[PDB]
Write a protein that binds this ligand. Structure first.
Ligand SMILES: CCCCCC(=O)OC[C@H](COP(=O)(O)OC[C@H](N)C(=O)O)OC(=O)CCCCC
Ligand SMILES: CCCCCC(=O)OC[C@H](COP(=O)(O)OC[C@H](N)C(=O)O)OC(=O)CCCCC
Ligand SMILES: [Ca+2]
Ligand SMILES: [Ca+2]
Ligand SMILES: [Ca+2]
Ligand SMILES: [Ca+2]
Ligand SMILES: [Ca+2]
Ligand SMILES: [Ca+2]
Ligand SMILES: [Ca+2]
Ligand SMILES: [Ca+2]
Ligand SMILES: [Ca+2]
Length: 1547
C-alpha cells in the first residue's frame, strides 16, 4: 500500500474536549443472564435423581427432577434479571451445580459444581457460550476426580446489546464433550487445585467509626468464598500479619477478589473501604506467563467522606460500588498462588477457608519513605452552583490524610518545620448570572502546599505514565481519524498510518526507558513479572502496529480502526498499576466547613520526572477540573448543574526535585509567602500576585443547533444558549418552539483579562462551557444540555489570514449527563487586544436585519455560504394519530419547515374516512449551505386544524440528516443501465411437509453463518433478523417519520422514545440544487404534478388480506412463578384484535405454534401489524412477554414485492406448493408492465426473453399424479429469481422466508426477551383470492411400541448376606422404563435366592410411545404435578433404561446396576454373556453403534454398571434382552401380552 502518512492533527478534534461531568462509571444498567441447561452426562452417583441448581449471584433456580439416571436431559431455560453497575454485575458468580434427594425438608446432597463469574461469559466473542459442557468437580475435596459434565448455554446481555443467537435446529448429533468444554480460550481442560494466600499485614490512616475509636478487620471475598482476619480492637493503625487462604481451581474463572476493611460493632457491621484485585492484571497465562502474585505492597482504598454521621448516604462508596470521594485507609497486602499436588496424600484434601499467621515483612520491602511535595495554584474558580454559594467558599486539597484539617490528624510524621497550608482562604462569591457564581481571585491566586511521606515506588507510576502517554497519543489519533472520517476530510489513511507509526515508535520508546531501574532491591515479584510482560506485550504491539500500518488502505480505514481500538484497550488494561504507591489527590469545595463537591486527580498524572514520557500528563500544567456531587448525587437531575469549575495548576514530586515546581505557571507573578518563608528562595508561596495581564476578546459565533432535547410538553423547546468564559457569561436570544434553533448570533466578551503570559496559550486555550436552556413562561429554565469548546487563539502579532482564520463552524457534541442531546454548530476565537488597541481586531459588522439592533450576526466568512435548493415533499398519509389533549385528531395538516422557508400540505378535511392528501407533491425553495454536513434539519410538524385559526400541536419529527434524500444526478452511463446485448442465463417424497423444507433451510442458514467464520429438498430463506434488516426497511420510495410529543425522558427514568410516538407521517423528501439541468430533469421524467416522485403507486384505499404465519418462538422470558410461561399469539391490526387464549401452549418457553391468522385490513390505514406473545394466566390479567411491529404499509407498496415471497422452485403439489394465487408468469407480466420492460416473451415453453436477457429452465410441470403438461412457470420463476440482474428497473425480490423478529417489552426496554419466527403474506382482495393457508402446524408424532424381552441375567452381584449361615445371594429382578419411572416402569417377577447371579425371567415389556423422527424425541402429554391446571407436552430423548435390583421383604429394594441405551446410538449386544464386557457401555469407540429405528430387532447381552466408593465404574451384572421396535399399525396386527401372558406366551 501507500507509505505516505500524516503525523500532526488535521481534523481539529482538540477544540472539542470530551469532558465527562459525571464519572460515567458504576452507573447501574439492566442486565440479563440467560442459562439453558440442556442435559448432563457421566454424572457420579448411585440411583441418583439429579436436579441442576443454577445460581447467579444470590438468586438460584432449579430444574425438574429426573429419576434414576446418570445422563439426564432437561432443556430448561432460566432468566436472571439484575439492575446493577457493570462491576457488581461481572463479579456475580454463576454456579451450575447438580444435587440429588432434594425435597421440602432436606437440602440436596451435592454431586459436583462449576464456578465461573459473569465477566468470563461477557468476555466471550458473542458474550456467550453455546452448547458447552461444564466440568463438574467436588468443591469440598481436592482429591476427588471428575463429577460429570452439564451441557448448557450461558449468555449475558446488557441494555442495548446484540447477540448473534444460533437457531434451534434438530440437534441429532453426538458432539464431543472434551472438544466442547465450558472454558474460555487458553484454559487447560484439566484444572489443578491451588491455594490463594491473601496475606494481610497492616493498615494505616483509618477514620473515626464509633462516634470515636475503630475496631477493624479485613474480609476477603473470592469466587463466592469468604474469610476474615481477627479484630484489632481500638487502633487506627492495626497490625494483623494474617493470611486468608482460599482453596479453588486454577486458573480461576472468577477473576476479581474483593478485599474489604470492615469495622466491628455490635449494633451494625459497616464497611470502611474496598479494593478489588483483578487477577487478570496480576497474572499471565501460558508457559511464558506467571502465577497470580502481588505485594508486599500498599493498596489505597477510597469511599465516603471520613467525617462521622449517624446515617451515611454515601455508604455504598465504602462498599466499593462507586467512585471514591475521600481517602479511607491504605493497606499492606500480598497475594501468592501455590499449585497443590493433589496426588500427594500428606496434605489435607479439605477446601475450607483457612486463616493462618502470615510471615511478617519489613517496611523496607515496600520502598524507603521519601518526602513528597504537592503544590497547587487556584488560578480560576468559576461556575459555582448558586444553590450552595450564599456563604464564603474554601477549596481544600488532601492527598491521603495529609492536609485533612477539618476531619482530624490521622497522620504520621515521617524546609525545616514547614507547616502545610492545604486550604484556600475563604472568599465570598460574586454573581455571574442567575445560576452560577465565581470567586473573584483576579490577580491574587490562592495557593496550597502539602508535605507528605510515601514509599518510593515512583518507577511503577513512571511505567504507567509512559504506557498511558502512548495510550493517550493513540486515543487522540484514533479520535482524529474518526472525526476526519465523519467530517469527510481528505485522505484519512495517511493519518491512520501516521498514528500506527507513532504508536510503534512509542512502543519502541517504552522498552528503552523501563529497564533503567533493574537494580532496585525494593521491588516485588509482581513488579518484575509485570515489567517483563509489559515489555513483551509492547514489543509484540510495535510489530503488530507495523504490520497493521502495512495494511491500511482507502477502503479499509473503517476496519483497521477497530483493530487499533483493541490496541487502545490493551494499553489501557496494561497501564493500570495494581500496586498502589501514592493515593489520589482530592480537591473539595467547602462552605461553613461542609463538603459540597469533589474532584479526584490520579496521583501519577501529577508526578514529576526528568524524562518527558515518565512525566505525568497534568504535572506542571493548568488542569481544568469540574467538581461534581459525591456518590449518587452527581447522577441525574442533581448532577446536571456544574458544581464548580477550576483552573488548578498542580505539581507533585520529590522535595529534592522541587527546584522547577513553578515553571508551568503563566509568567509575570510575584510570590507572596508566609512568615516562615521570609527571605527563603525555596519556600513555596501561599499566593501569587500577577502583575502581567493580557487584554482579550472572545467571539462566540453561535450559528445553529440541531437534534436538541425536548423540555416542554409539546415536544419542543424554547432554547437559548449561555456561553461561559472565565468569570463572565452572555446569553443568546430565545427562539420559541424549536428543537433546531438558528440563533445566528455573535456574543462578544469585551475587555477580558487573562492574568499572566501563559505558556503555550495558542496550543492550550482556556475552555468554554456552553449550556443550552429551555426558557419557560414564569421565569425558570430547564437544563437542556452542555457542550465544551476551545477557542482559536489569535495573538497580537498574528495575521487574521487563511488557512487558520476566520474559524469555520463545527459541531460540538452536547450532553445531558451521558445522554447525547444534540449538536451545536458554532465557532470560537480568542483574539488578543494588541498594543494598538482594538484597531488590530477584525471589523464587527451590523446585522442584515436592522430590527435586531444590538444583537450581532455571525459574520461573513464564518457563516456558511448559501445556495438555492428545492425541497420536494411527498405527502402520502398520516397513520395512528393518537389523541391530543382529550379530543381526537380530526382535521390534520402537515407543516414542513426548513431554515425558515417551508410548505404546508393540503388539509385533510376528515381523517377517519380517508387519511390522505389531495395534493400528493408540493415543494418549496430554501437557501441551504454548500457543505452538505452543515445542512439544517427539516422539521415535519403535524397540527390539528380547528376553526377560527386555532391550531394544536399533534406531533413533530426532526429529519436530522437530509443527505439520504439529496438527489444527486445518477450515472446512467454505467454498464448496469445497458439494455443491449444478448445475455443467456441457464438453470420417500410423499412424507415431506413444510417442516422438511424449514429444517433444510435452518441447516443451510446454520452452515452459511459458519462459512464466513473461516435427493434434494427445495428451500426457503431463513433470516436471522427481521425482513426489514435485509431490504433496508423497505424505504426505497416511502419513508416513515415518527411524530413525537411530550418531554424527552431522563437517562434513568421517565418517558421513553417509543412512548413519545404519537403518530407516523408517511412520505418522502427530495432535495436538489437549483437550477436543475434539463437533461437531468427529463432523465427523471418530472411531470409537473409529481416532481421527482415518479412511479408513485395509487393512493386509493384497497382491502388487503393479511395472513400471518407464526412458526415458533424461542427463548421466551418467563412470566410465571414456576419459571415458565404459557404463550399464545395475539395479533392487533387495525380494529381487529385477535387474542388466541384458547390455544395457549402450557409451560413452554420454546413453543412451536404452527398457526395462521387471517385479518382483512383496509390498507393503507390499517397497516401497523403488532404480533405479540402473551403468557396466559388462570387468575389475573395475561402478561405481555413481548411484541413486534412490522409496518406492512412499507412492505405492500415496495418495489421489492414484499407481499408474498417467491419460492425457489415452482410446483403445484406437495410440500413445496406455490402459495401465491398469482402464478410466476403473472408476477413476471405484472413486473414487466409496471417497469415498462419489453416482455415477457415466451417462445417455446423452456425459455423466456425479458429485456436483453434470455432465461432457460425446465419446461414441464408435475400435476400430482406423475403426468406432465408443458408450462411456462419454471422459466418465469427463474426470471423472477434473477430479477435483480434486469438493467432498467431490476430489483432483488423478496423470497419465501421465515424472519426472526425480536420480541420487545416496553416495561423491560432495551433487552430482547424473545425471538418470534414468522412471516407475513399479503394478498389484495381485488385480485383472485388465495387458497387455504399452508399446513405449518407441528408434526404429529408417529406411534410406536418397543418390546423388550428380558430373557436372563448373568454374573449379577450378590447383595444379600445370610443372617445365619453367611453365604451370599441376590433376589434379582429387572426394572425397565422408556418414558420415566412414574409413567412406563415395569418390573419382572423376582428370581428369588440366586446363589450365582443367574436369573431366569422371560418377561416382556411393552412401551407404547409417540416419536418425532426429526427431533429424535419421545413426545408425551402429562401434568407437571398433581395440582396443575393443564397437560404439558414434554420432549425427552428416546432412551430405554434397564436396571437390576435386589428385592427385600423387610426393607427397600437395593439398586445393583443400570444401563441407559440411547435408542439411536446404543452399542450392539454381545452374542454370549462371556463376550459382554465393561467396554461396551464405557467410552471405548471400538464397539459399533446400532439404531433400533433402522435395525428394528437387536438381541444380545448388555453390561450394567454401578459406581463404588472409589467413584469408578464396575461390572455388577449382565442382562440378555431382545429389543423389537414396531409401529402401532404393526402392533395391532400382531398383538402380544404383558409379561408371559397371551398372545405369544413366554415360559
Ligand atoms: C397466594 C399465592 C401467591 C403466589 C405468588 C404470587 O404472587 O402469584 C401471583 C399469581 C400469578 O400471577 P403471575 O403469574 O402473573 O405472577 C408472576 C409474575 N408475573 C412474574 O413473572 O414474576 O397471581 C395471582 O395469584 C393473582 C393476583 C391478582 C388477582 C386479581
Ligand atoms: C386436583 C386439584 C387441581 C388444582 C388445579 C389448580 O388449582 O391449579 C392452579 C394452580 C396450578 O396451576 P398451574 O401451575 O398449571 O398454572 C397454570 C398457568 N401456568 C398459570 O400461570 O396460571 O394450583 C396451585 O398453584 C396449587 C393448587 C392447590 C390445590 C389444593
Ligand atoms: Ca467499632
Ligand atoms: Ca419547560
Ligand atoms: Ca419552554
Ligand atoms: Ca403469569
Ligand atoms: Ca401463566
Ligand atoms: Ca398476570
Ligand atoms: Ca437386600
Ligand atoms: Ca433381597
Ligand atoms: Ca435393602
Amino acid at each position: 500500500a501507500s507509505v505516505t502518512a500524516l503525523t500532526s492533527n488535521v481534523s481539529n478534534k482538540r477544540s472539542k474536549p470530551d469532558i465527562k461531568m459525571e464519572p460515567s462509571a458504576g452507573r447501574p444498567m439492566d442486565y440479563q443472564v440467560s442459562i439453558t441447561v440442556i442435559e448432563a452426562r457421566q454424572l457420579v452417583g448411585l440411583n441418583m435423581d439429579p436436579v441442576v441448581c443454577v445460581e447467579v449471584g444470590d438468586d438460584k433456580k432449579y430444574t425438574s427432577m429426573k429419576e434414576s439416571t446418570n445422563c439426564p436431559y432437561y432443556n430448561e431455560y432460566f432468566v436472571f434479571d439484575f439492575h446493577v453497575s457493570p462491576d457488581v454485575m461481572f463479579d456475580k458468580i454463576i454456579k451450575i451445580s447438580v444435587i440429588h434427594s432434594k425435597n421440602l425438608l432436606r437440602s440436596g446432597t451435592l454431586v459436583g459444581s462449576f464456578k465461573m463469574d459473569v465477566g468470563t461469559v461477557y468476555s466471550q466473542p458473542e458474550h456467550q457460550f453455546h452448547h458447552k459442557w461444564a466440568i463438574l468437580s467436588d468443591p469440598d475435596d481436592i482429591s476427588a476426580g471428575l463429577k460429570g459434565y452439564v451441557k448448557c448455554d450461558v449468555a449475558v446481555v446488557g441494555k442495548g446489546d446484540n447477540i448473534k443467537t444460533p437457531h434451534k435446529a434438530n440437534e441429532t448429533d453426538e458432539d464431543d464433550i472434551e472438544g466442547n468444554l465450558l472454558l474460555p480460550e487458553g484454559v487447560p481442560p484439566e484444572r489443578q487445585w491451588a491455594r490463594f494466600y491473601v496475606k494481610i499485614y497492616r493498615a494505616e490512616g483509618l477514620p473515626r467509626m464509633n462516634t470515636d475509636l475503630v475496631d477493624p478487620y479485613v474480609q476477603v471475598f473470592f469466587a463466592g468464598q469468604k474469610g476474615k482476619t481477627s479484630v484489632q480492637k481500638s487502633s487506627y493503625e492495626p497490625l494483623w500479619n494474617e493470611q486468608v487462604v482460599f482453596t479453588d481451581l486454577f486458573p480461576p474463572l472468577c477473576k476479581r477478589m474483593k478485599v474489604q476493611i470492615r469495622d466491628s460493632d455490635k449494633v451494625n457491621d459497616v464497611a470502611i473501604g474496598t479494593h478489588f484485585i483483578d487477577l487478570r492484571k496480576i497474572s499471565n497465562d501460558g508457559d511464558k506467563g506467571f502465577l497470580p502474585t502481588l505485594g508486599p505492597a500498599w493498596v489505597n482504598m477510597y469511599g465516603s467522606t471520613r467525617n462521622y454521621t449517624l446515617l451515611d448516604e454515601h455508604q455504598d462508596l465504602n462498599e466499593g460500588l462507586g467512585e471514591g470521594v475521600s481517602f479511607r485507609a491504605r493497606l499492606m497486602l500480598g497475594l501468592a498462588v501455590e499449585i497443590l499436588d493433589t496426588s500427594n496424600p500428606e496434605l489435607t484434601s479439605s477446601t475450607e477457608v483457612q486463616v493462618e499467621q502470615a510471615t511478617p515483612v519489613s517496611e523496607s520491602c515496600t520502598g524507603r519513605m521519601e518526602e513528597f511535595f504537592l503544590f497547587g495554584a487556584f488560578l480560576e474558580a468559576s461556575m459555582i452552583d448558586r444553590k450552595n454559594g450564599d456563604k464564603p467558599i474554601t477549596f481544600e486539597v488532601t492527598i491521603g490524610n495529609y492536609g485533612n484539617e477539618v476531619d482530624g490528624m490521622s497522620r504520621p510524621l515521617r524546609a525545616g518545620d514547614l507547616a502545610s497550608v492545604s486550604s484556600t482562604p475563604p472568599m465570598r462569591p460574586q454573581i455571574t448570572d442567575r445560576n452560577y457564581f465565581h470567586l473573584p481571585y483576579l490577580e491574587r491566586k490562592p495557593c496550597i502546599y502539602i508535605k507528605s511521606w510515601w514509599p518510593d515506588q515512583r518507577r511503577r507510576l513512571y511505567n504507567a505514565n509512559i504506557m498511558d502517554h502512548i495510550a493517550d497519543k493513540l486515543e487522540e489519533g484514533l479520535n482524529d481519524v474518526q472525526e476526519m472520517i465523519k467530517t469527510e476530510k481528505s485522505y484519512p489513511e495517511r493519518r491512520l498510518r501516521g498514528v500506527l507509526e507513532e504508536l510503534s515508535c512509542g512502543c519502541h520508546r517504552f522498552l528503552s526507558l523501563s529497564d533503567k531501574d533493574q537494580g532496585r532491591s525494593s521491588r516485588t515479584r509482581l513488579d518484575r513479572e509485570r515489567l517483563k510482560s509489559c515489555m513483551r506485550e509492547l514489543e509484540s504491539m510495535g510489530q503488530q502496529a507495523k504490520s497493521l500500518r502495512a495494511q491500511v488502505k482507502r477502503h479499509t480505514v473503517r476496519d483497521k480502526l477497530r483493530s487499533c481500538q483493541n490496541f487502545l484497550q490493551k494499553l489501557r488494561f496494561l497501564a493500570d498499576e495494581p500496586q498502589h504507591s501514592i493515593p489520589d489527590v482530592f480537591i473539595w469545595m467547602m462552605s461553613n466547613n461542609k463538603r459540597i463537591a469533589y474532584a479526584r486527580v490520579p496521583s501519577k498524572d501529577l508526578l514529576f520526572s526528568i524524562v518527558e514520557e515518565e512525566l505525568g500528563k497534568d504535572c506542571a500544567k493548568v488542569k481544568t477540573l469540574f467538581l461534581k456531587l459525591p456518590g449518587k448525587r452527581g447522577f441525574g437531575s442533581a448532577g446536571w448543574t456544574v458544581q464548580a469549575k477550576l483552573e488548578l495548576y498542580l505539581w507533585l514530586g520529590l522535595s529534592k526535585q522541587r527546584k522547577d515546581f513553578l515553571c508551568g505557571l503563566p509568567c509575570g507573578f510575584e510570590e507572596v509567602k508566609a512568615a516562615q518563608g521570609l527571605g527563603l528562595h525555596s519556600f513555596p508561596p501561599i499566593s501569587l500576585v500577577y502583575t502581567k495581564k493580557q487584554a482579550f476578546q472572545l467571539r462566540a459565533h453561535m450559528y445553529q443547533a440541531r437534534s436538541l432535547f425536548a423540555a416542554d410538553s409539546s415536544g419542543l423547546s424554547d432554547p437559548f444558549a449561555r456561553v461561559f468564559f472565565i468569570n463572565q457569561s452572555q446569553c443568546t436570544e430565545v427562539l420559541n418552539e424549536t428543537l433546531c434553533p438558528t440563533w445566528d448570533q455573535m456574543l462578544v466578551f469585551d475587555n477580558l483579562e487573562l492574568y499572566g503570559e501563559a505558556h503555550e496559550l495558542r496550543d492550550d486555550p482556556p475552555i468554554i462551557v456552553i449550556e443550552i436552556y429551555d426558557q419557560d413562561s414564569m421565569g425558570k429554565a430547564d437544563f437542556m444540555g452542555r457542550t465544551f469548546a476551545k477557542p482559536l487563539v489569535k495573538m497580537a502579532d498574528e495575521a487574521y489570514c487563511p488557512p487558520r482564520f476566520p474559524p469555520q463552524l463545527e459541531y460540538y457534541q452536547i450532553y445531558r449527563g451521558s445522554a447525547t442531546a444534540g449538536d451545536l454548530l458554532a465557532a470560537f476565537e480568542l483574539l488578543q487586544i494588541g498594543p494598538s488597541g482594538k484597531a488590530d481586531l477584525p471589523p464587527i459588522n451590523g446585522p442584515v436585519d436592522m430590527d435586531r439592533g444590538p444583537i450581532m450576526p455571525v459574520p461573513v466568512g464564518i457563516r456558511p455560504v448559501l445556495s438555492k435548493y428545492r425541497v420536494e415533499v411527498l405527502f402520502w398519509g398520516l397513520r395512528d394519530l393518537k389523541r391530543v389533549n382529550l379530543a381526537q385528531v380530526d382535521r390534520p395538516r402537515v407543516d414542513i419547515e426548513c431554515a425558515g422557508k417551508g410548505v404546508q400540505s393540503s388539509l385533510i378535511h376528515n381523517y377517519k374516512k380517508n387519511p390522505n392528501f389531495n395534493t400528493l407533491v408540493k415543494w418549496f425553495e430554501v437557501d441551504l449551505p454548500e457543505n452538505e454536513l452543515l445542512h439544517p434539519p427539516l422539521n415535519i410538524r403535524v397540527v390539528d386544524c380547528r376553526a377560527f385559526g386555532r391550531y394544536t400541536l399533534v406531533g413533530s419529527h426532526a429529519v436530522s440528516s437530509l443527505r439520504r434524500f439529496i438527489y444527486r444526478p445518477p450515472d446512467r452511463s454505467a454498464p448496469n443501465w445497458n439494455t443491449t446485448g444478448e445475455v443467456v442465463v441457464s438453470m420417500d417424497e410423499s412424507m415431506l411437509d413444510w417442516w422438511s423444507k424449514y429444517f433444510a433451510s435452518i441447516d443451510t442458514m446454520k452452515e452459511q453463518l459458519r462459512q464466513h467464520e473461516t435427493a434434494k429438498i427445495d428451500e426457503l430463506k431463513v433470516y436471522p433478523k427481521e425482513l426489514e434488516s435485509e431490504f433496508d426497511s423497505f424505504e426505497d420510495w416511502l419513508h416513515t417519520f415518527n411524530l413525537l410529543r411530550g418531554k424527552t425522558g431522563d437517562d434513568e427514568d421517565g418517558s421513553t422514545e417509543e412512548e413519545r410516538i404519537v403518530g407516523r407521517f408517511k412520505g418522502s423528501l427530495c432535495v436538489y440544487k437549483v437550477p436543475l439541468p434539463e437533461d437531468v430533469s427529463r432523465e427523471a421524467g418530472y411531470d409537473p404534478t409529481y416532481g421527482m416522485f415518479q412511479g408513485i403507486p395509487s393512493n386509493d384505499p384497497i382491502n388487503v388480506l393479511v395472513r400471518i404465519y407464526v412458526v415458533r418462538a424461542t427463548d421466551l422470558h418467563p412470566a410465571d412463578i414456576n419459571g415458565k410461561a404459557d404463550p399464545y399469539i395475539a395479533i392487533k391490526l387495525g380494529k381487529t384484535d385477535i387474542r388466541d387464549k384458547e390455544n395457549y401452549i402450557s409451560k413452554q418457553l420454546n413453543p412451536v405454534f404452527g398457526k395462521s391468522f387471517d385479518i382483512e385490513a383496509s390498507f393503507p390505514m390499517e397497516s401497523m401489524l403488532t404480533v405479540a406473545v402473551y403468557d396466559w394466566d388462570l387468575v389475573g390479567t395475561d402478561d405481555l412477554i413481548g411484541e413486534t411491529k412490522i409496518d406492512l404499509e412499507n412492505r405492500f407498496y415496495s418495489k421489492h414485492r414484499a407481499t408474498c415471497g417467491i419460492a425457489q422452485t415452482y410446483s403445484i403439489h406437495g410440500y413445496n406448493i406455490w402459495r401465491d394465487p398469482m402464478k410466476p408468469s403473472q408476477i413476471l407480466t405484472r413486473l414487466c408492465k409496471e417497469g415498462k420492460v419489453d416482455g415477457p416473451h415466451f417462445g417455446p415453453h423452456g425459455r423466456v426473453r425479458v429485456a436483453n436477457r434470455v432465461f432457460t429452465g425446465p419446461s414441464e410441470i408435475e400435476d400430482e399424479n406423475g403426468q406432465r403438461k408443458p408450462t411456462d412457470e419454471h422459466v418465469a420463476l427463474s426470471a423472477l429469481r434473477h430479477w435483480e440482474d434486469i438493467p432498467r428497473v431490476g430489483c432483488r425480490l423478496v423470497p419465501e422466508h421465515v424472519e426472526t423478529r425480536p420480541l420487545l417489552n416496553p416495561d423491560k426496554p432495551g433487552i430482547e426477551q424473545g425471538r418470534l419466527e414468522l412471516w407475513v403474506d399479503m394478498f389484495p382482495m381485488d385480485m383472485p383470492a388465495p387458497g387455504t393457508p399452508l399446513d405449518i402446524s407441528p408434526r404429529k408424532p408417529k406411534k410406536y411400541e418397543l418390546r423388550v424381552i428380558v430373557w436372563n441375567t448373568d454374573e449379577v452381584v450378590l447383595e444379600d448376606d445370610d443372617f445365619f449361615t453367611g453365604e451370599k445371594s441376590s433376589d434379582i429382578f429387572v426394572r425397565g422404563w422408556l418414558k420415566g419411572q412414574q409413567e412406563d416402569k415395569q418390573d419382572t417377577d423376582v428370581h428369588y435366592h440366586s446363589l450365582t447371579g443367574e436369573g431366569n425371567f422371560n418377561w416382556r415389556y411393552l412401551f407404547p410411545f409417540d416419536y418425532l423422527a426429526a427431533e429424535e424425541k419421545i413426545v408425551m402429554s402429562k401434568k407437571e404435578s398433581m395440582f396443575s391446571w393443564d397437560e404439558t407436552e414434554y420432549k425427552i430423548p428416546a432412551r430405554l433404561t434397564l436396571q437390576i435390583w435386589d428385592a427385600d421383604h423387610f426393607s427397600a429394594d437395593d439398586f445393583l446396576g443400570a444401563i441407559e441405551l440411547d435408542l439411536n446410538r446404543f452399542p450392539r449386544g454381545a452374542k454370549t454373556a462371556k463376550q459382554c464386557t465393561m467396554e461396551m457401555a464405557t467410552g471405548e469407540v471400538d464397539v459399533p453403534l446400532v439404531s433400533i429405528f433402522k435395525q428394528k430387532r437387536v438381541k444380545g447381552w448388555w453390561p450394567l454398571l454401578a459406581r463404588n466408593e472409589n467413584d469408578e465404574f464396575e461390572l455388577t451384572g449382565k442382562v440378555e434382552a431382545e429389543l423389537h421396535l414396531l409401529t402401532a399399525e404393526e402392533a395391532e396386527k400382531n398383538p402380544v401380552g404383558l409379561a408371559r401372558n397371551e398372545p405369544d406366551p413366554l415360559e
